[PDB]
Amino acid sequence: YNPEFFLYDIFLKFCLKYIDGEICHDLFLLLGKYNILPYDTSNDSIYACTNIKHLDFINPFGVAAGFDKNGVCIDSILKLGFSFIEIGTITPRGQTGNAKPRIFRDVESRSIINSCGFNNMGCDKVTENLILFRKRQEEDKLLSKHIVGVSIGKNKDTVNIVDDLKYCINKIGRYADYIAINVSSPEAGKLKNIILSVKEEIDNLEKNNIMNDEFLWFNTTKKKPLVFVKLAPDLNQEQKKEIADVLLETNIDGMIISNTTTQINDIKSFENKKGGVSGAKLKDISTKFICEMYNYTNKQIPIIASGGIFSGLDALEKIEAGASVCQLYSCLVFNGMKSAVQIKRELNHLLYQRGYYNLKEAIGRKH
Ligand SMILES: Cc1cc2nc3c(=O)[nH]c(=O)nc-3n(C[C@H](O)[C@H](O)[C@H](O)COP(=O)(O)O)c2cc1C
Ligand SMILES: Cc1cc(Nc2ccc(S(F)(F)(F)(F)F)cc2)n2nc(C(C)(F)F)nc2n1
Ligand SMILES: O=C(O)c1cc(=O)[nH]c(=O)[nH]1
């Protein structure tokens, strides 16, 4: 609640009004890189703890993929009050992505559309960035117990998809607390192949190193990274159940629901635009998708929420629907740096008013 946050949020609101989106994004990533952004040093409520398997989160809010694609601003973003961040999506080789401008935002609807095109510095350089962070994390009190996942994907013109992801794992898998596979860009038999192949590569990292785990997994968990998969919402009920089966057969560690959507036409400033939409308008679509997969998987696979989360209320819908954890993106654009502090406040208070003992008790409370 400091003036630090408050003053910065004025600057951001101003930037939001006048300056191009991707230009704004990079500007504040830069400010974070030089560590002049504010901190949230509050103790988080132990009643809003959560986990995905043996992967524990000190609080249920993190940042989604695509926000810090190259892992350049990991400390500063985590210290805003987030329990974790998902970097990437990265590819084995650097990409430029599509032509600019490629990101636009509608303020009134609190929505965004993008056709970035998986721009990133490539797996090699980003791994060097994550390593440097991991080294800083050993020295910084505030980064303890904070989780860093890595989103991985295939190059535009890939020879083979699996091989792209395989390279990324070999390079960066040691520094990741979990690995996110996203097949959501704006047959199931080919998916199962991918998922398995990823678990095997991770399992191979363990086998082919002589070191014990403490000195092998240079991450937070000190164990091999979990395997999540991120799904787009533009599928039919048949696709979803077909996939739902796969995730069970592979015994995947969690699923990130969801990515952006192409099926929104009622945003006026966006009618000229191609890409995937995110923000408020994605909220209701996203939540429904969680109920479905939660049902289709019969509640065996943990879920990670993404799509139009702005408030402690929005967060609770995802949780009761079946999510264990939430990711923010659009909220930070429209609500600023206070988003983590603010949303954690709002959620803690609601859990009380809704008579919940803790957050885990509320997970999947939509029958
Ligand atoms: C500019 C931009 C870039 C994104 N890049 C990625 C990405 O690289 N990988 C990914 O899985 N999701 C990416 N996303 C999607 C977000 O991770 C998130 O799923 C989506 O924005 C919905 O969250 P929200 O409604 O809170 O904004 C991107 C979104 C935006 C707006
Ligand atoms: C004012 C503004 C800010 C912003 N992103 C953003 C906002 C805040 C921060 S941060 F991380 F201030 F501490 F929270 F630096 C980092 C990135 N974006 N991102 C975009 C976009 C949609 F182009 F990606 N437009 C923006 N406009
Ligand atoms: O980089 C992108 O263009 C992108 C990737 C993704 O997974 N989702 C999205 O909305 N954009």
From Swiss-Prot:
GO cellular component: mitochondrial inner membrane
Keyword Transmembrane among record annotations: yes
Catalysed reactions, semicolon-separated: (S)-dihydroorotate + a quinone = orotate + a quinol
Keywords for this protein: Flavoprotein, FMN, Membrane, Mitochondrion, Mitochondrion inner membrane, Oxidoreductase, Pyrimidine biosynthesis, Transit peptide, Transmembrane, Transmembrane helix
Active-site feature positions: S185 (nucleophile)
Domain of life: Eukaryota
The EC number(s) this enzyme carries: 1.3.5.2
A Gene Ontology biological process term: 'de novo' UMP biosynthetic process
Leading EC class: oxidoreductase
Residues involved in substrate binding: K69, N114, S115, C116, G117, F118, N182, N259, T260
DNA-binding found in the keyword field: no
Compartment(s) where it occurs, according to its Swiss-Prot or TrEMBL record: Mitochondrion inner membrane
Cofactor note: Binds 1 FMN per subunit.
Main localization category: mitochondrion
Cofactor list: FMN
Residues engaged in binding FMN: 65-69, 89, 182, 230, 278-279, 306-308, 329-330
GO terms, molecular function: dihydroorotate dehydrogenase (quinone) activity; dihydroorotate dehydrogenase activity
Membrane topology: Single-pass membrane protein
Pathway terms, separated by semicolons: Pyrimidine metabolism; UMP biosynthesis via de novo pathway; orotate from (S)-dihydroorotate (quinone route): step 1/1
Family: Belongs to the dihydroorotate dehydrogenase family. Type 2 subfamily.
Role description: Catalyzes the conversion of dihydroorotate to orotate with quinone as electron acceptor.
Subunit structure, interactors included: Monomer.
Protein name: Dihydroorotate dehydrogenase (quinone), mitochondrial
Species per Swiss-Prot/TrEMBL record: Plasmodium falciparum (isolate 3D7)
